[PDB]
Amino acid sequence: NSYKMDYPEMGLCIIINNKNFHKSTGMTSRSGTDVDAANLRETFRNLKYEVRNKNDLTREEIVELMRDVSKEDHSKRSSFVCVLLSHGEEGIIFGTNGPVDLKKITNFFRGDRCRSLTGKPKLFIIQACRGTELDCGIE
Amino acid sequence: KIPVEADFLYAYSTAPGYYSWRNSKDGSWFIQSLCAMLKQYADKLEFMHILTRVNRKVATEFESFSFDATFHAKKQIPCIVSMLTKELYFYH
């Protein structure tokens, strides 16, 4: 069957948009991620989500944000959406100053650690690299 | 009891191990495609079928353009990882 999506609120849509990185990372700025974050804000607004755009967060600011969001009362919300736009590698997303385990982010919302989201869909949308392989395609 | 890992869905822009692609002007291929399929089908299709459309749009409508031959004419497939236990519809 189907998730109950007619709670009073569809829920939160957190967008973390890391464009500019510290030189210690060697990471290039991510030209065009602003277009992404604006496209997503409008898309989820039309889906009746409460959108929160956050820009250029360190790895410590991301963890703390995720902890704070997981501590809110989602009792009247149908779902939770988080969008990460950044550099990455397998299992890893980058704050402006360094890497974060994706599992550390998502663990805050585990069904036993975020009780007001137990049984509700938790969607993590991840635009980031997961390694350095290139797909040459076929035909 | 349910599992503590249940009811998660990870929509990855690219497959394990791979680069993910982004256009300087229009944004990342994946997010571009996701917003368009949501715009067009959030009132019509279950979420996994929307993400499947996103997979086909990224797979068929994009190919890298680079002055560096190493990084030119490359392709990308997104990666839907679902621990969901129910269908997800954004409409009533």
Binding site: - | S20, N23, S24, S66
Partner: peptide
């Protein structure tokens, strides 16, 4: 132009 994340 296309760039890699």
């Amino acid at each position: 132009v296309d760039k890699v994340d």
